[PDB]
Amino acid sequence: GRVIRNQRKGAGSIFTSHTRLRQGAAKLRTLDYAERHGYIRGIVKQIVHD
Amino acid sequence: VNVPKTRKTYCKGKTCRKHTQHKVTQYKAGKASLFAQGKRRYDRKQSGFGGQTKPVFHKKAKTTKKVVLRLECVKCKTRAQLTLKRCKHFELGGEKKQKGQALQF
Amino acid sequence: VKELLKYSNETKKRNFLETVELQVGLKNYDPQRDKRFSGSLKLPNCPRPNMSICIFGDAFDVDRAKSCGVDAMSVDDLKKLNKNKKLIKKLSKKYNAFIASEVLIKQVPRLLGPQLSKAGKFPTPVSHNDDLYGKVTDVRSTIKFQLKKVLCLAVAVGNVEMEEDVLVNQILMSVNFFVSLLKKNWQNVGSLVVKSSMGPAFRL
């Protein structure tokens, strides 16, 4: 026989992420001393569109 | 097919070798198990990749088998091998052929 | 082995406080089946008695009617078939012959319930009466498989010895390993307990 659509995507060549216009990972921060004892203030400056 | 459960005939049993009495029965298949040379011989070539090494048989065209009689002599312990000819229904007890019966009920 | 201390050897002829004869019972243990072809029959050969005073319903004529008075109990004949049809059941183990196999069709109306008829279960109808009478008054009980698998009889009374009660359960034990097929189990001689009526039971 041949190969199907999902068996082909296992390599991930064109089936991958088109990431470029992304300003990074929208993660958080590492939970430390301040984040589990009181707090800390973060100031938002710009809110663009991903 | 009806036959006797006993029959007199020639039995070359050394001390005998004349007409005696044998209590007739039937030959059973037995048991194959292991120890057979072909058993180890077969599962030698059979062990591993390749699947089936020797042929089978799916060409069964026969419907009947030859019934063998296993009658042992009540004098010298020796059993006898007597076969007949392919049948369907079989027996050896009673219900022999009676003189004159009808088709009642 | 069995000839040592107990089972049905010597330690029972002392714990008896009764005036009557207290007979023992042979109760063995071995796993069998529920078929009639996988069951063992035959009667045991005992050289010693059981010390019993039971009454038999004997009846012989000809050359077996004079010896049927020294080995037997009561003098009965063949013409006696009109009397055995009313109410008498004082018969535990009887004895007939081949001289009375033709009028044995008149002993089933009042004597087929408790089995006082010569059929094919207990060896009773035979023309021999001088050798088998050391097994009637010298008691020779039967070995027949009941609902399951067991044979209950009597060895003897606890008023004999250990020289006589040692050659009774050693020769009867030869039919308890011989007539045994393979439709049964292991240990044809295991947990063997025996009691009389008064004195307790001792295992083996």
Binding site: - | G48, F49, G50, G51 | -
Partner: protein, 136 residues
């Protein structure tokens, strides 16, 4: 473990007897295979042998030992002067070691008639037609 055959998706192409993937024993032990891998890192030294020390369930541990065929202390001495010879160039890569002559079957016996002087050498030898100028 074993030596799974490098087949794409499990594609071998042949007789069923010639289609093994998991049940590939590989005629060499891990003791012999370990010596040859270190014979590639320290390929400048003449490897000797090794021995099984520890184990767990996934890894087999072996202790390796070699010598310096350039160091004067080893180049001399009539005890191990044979190691400094060209014929002793990476004895393990072939199987001239103790464990290599066990996996190859280099032994004396009626149990080693197919490997007396060489596995395939004996094969070639027996199958060759020795024809004299005067055919006997």
């Amino acid at each position: 473990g074993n030596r799974k055959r490098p087949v794409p998706k499990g594609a071998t192409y042949g007789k069923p007897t010639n289609q093994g993937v998991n049940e590939l024993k590989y005629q060499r032990s891990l003791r012999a295979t370990a010596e040859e891998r270190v014979g590639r890192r320290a390929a400048n030294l003449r490897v000797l042998n090794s021995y099984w020390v520890n184990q767990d369930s996934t890894y087999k541990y072996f202790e390796v030992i070699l010598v310096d065929p350039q160091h004067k202390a080893i180049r001399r001495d009539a005890r191990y002067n044979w190691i400094c010879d060209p014929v002793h160039k990476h004895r393990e890569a072939r199987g001239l070691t103790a464990t290599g002559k066990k996996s190859r079957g280099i032994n004396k016996g009626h149990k080693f008639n197919n490997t007396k002087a060489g596995r395939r050498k004996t094969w070639k030898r027996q199958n060759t037609l020795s024809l004299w100028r005067y055919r006997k």
